[PDB]
């Protein structure tokens, strides 16, 4: 019947372990494991009571589980459903319910390990542009919220090692949609662009979702080479289920044109894109520099928990 708060009472550790090939270590890279302390007291929580944990700047959980239980010695005290932020919200959450149990307990406390990745940008969507300012390279405090209470720990987030001068690409699985977002940022022209053509063509096995496309110019890029703004400029979009192409005219100095689209793949863990990549800098000659990338999925992990019950 009631909402309780403060069930998640500590943020114990935040540790990265590689779950994908190729990608540098950074906030978005699968997988970060957050270990949190949790406690339930039967004097202050009844079966059916609900509680929620908010995870700011978290894109998704790196698990196919729909829920995780808060357990101690193989008894389930509560069930928490995963609610990924993805492109809907800037934060993720757990919506939890206290479970009925077959024998009484006085109180129980333990820890829970949650596989997550953080959102620090990746498209021109409102969510990603907001989250592009979530963290900076180096030392950051990561804070989650349970009601009005805050639980935090420190972490070192590495910047992308890829030079911001060249083109930037990124592919991100959006699990609840069985789709990816795929980004292309044009190489830098320091004093602006006269024109260019940006986009990609999908090989058999994947298609472009023309209903979820963002085109913009960003005022620089962040520590992970992602757009931080999306302003308008003169362009023509040509989008088909096989290809997206954007031809554009002048872009000012300090801005970076980019395009992103959703991709539906028959095999979400493998698709190929051939990128157009044409640009003409102001006071420069036209560069034509197509390339191809085959994008490989990451491995999922499971959330789990442990704890100790006091009986009385």
């Amino acid at each position: 019947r009631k909402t309780i708060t403060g069930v998640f009472n500590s943020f114990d550790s935040l540790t990265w372990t590689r779950s994908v090939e190729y990608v540098y270590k950074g906030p978005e890279t699968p997988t970060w494991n957050a270990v949190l302390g949790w406690s339930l007291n039967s004097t202050t929580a009844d079966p059916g009571d609900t509680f929620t944990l908010i995870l700011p700047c978290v894109f998704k959980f790196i698990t196919t589980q729909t829920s995780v239980d808060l357990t101690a010695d193989g008894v389930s005290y509560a069930t928490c459903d995963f609610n990924a932020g993805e492109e809907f919200t800037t934060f993720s959450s757990l919506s939890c319910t206290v479970n009925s149990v077959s024998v009484s307990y006085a109180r129980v406390s333990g820890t829970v390990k949650l596989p997550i990745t953080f959102n620090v940008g990746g498209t021109g969507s409102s969510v990603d542009l907001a989250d592009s300012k979530c963290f900076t390279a180096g030392k950051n405090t990561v804070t989650f919220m349970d009601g009005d209470t805050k639980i935090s720990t420190t972490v070192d987030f590495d910047a992308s090692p890829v030079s911001p001068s060249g083109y930037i690409t990124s592919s991100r699985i959006i699990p609840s949609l069985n789709k990816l977002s795929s980004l292309f940022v044009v190489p830098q022209c320091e004093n602006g662009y006269t024109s260019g053509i940006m986009g990609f063509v999908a090989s058999n096995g994947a298609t472009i979702d023309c209903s979820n496309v963002n085109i913009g110019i960003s005022k620089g890029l962040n520590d992970w080479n992602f757009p931080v703004s999306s302003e308008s400029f003169s362009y023509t979009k040509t989008c088909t289920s096989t290809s997206i192409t954007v031809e554009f005219q002048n872009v000012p100095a300090g801005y970076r044109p980019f395009v992103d689209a959703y991709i539906s793949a028959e095999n979400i863990d493998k698709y190929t894109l051939t990128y157009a990549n044409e640009y003409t800098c102001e006071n420069g000659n036209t560069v034509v520099d197509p390339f191809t990338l085959t994008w490989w999925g990451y491995k999922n992990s499971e959330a789990d928990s442990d704890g100790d019950v006091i009986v009385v």
């Binding site: 090939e21 990608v23 978005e28 592919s171 991100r172 863990d269 990338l293 994008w295 490989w296 990451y298």
Partner: peptide, 7 residues
Amino acid sequence: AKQAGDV
């Protein structure tokens, strides 16, 4: 021509 990973 090159391999890359998803996030």
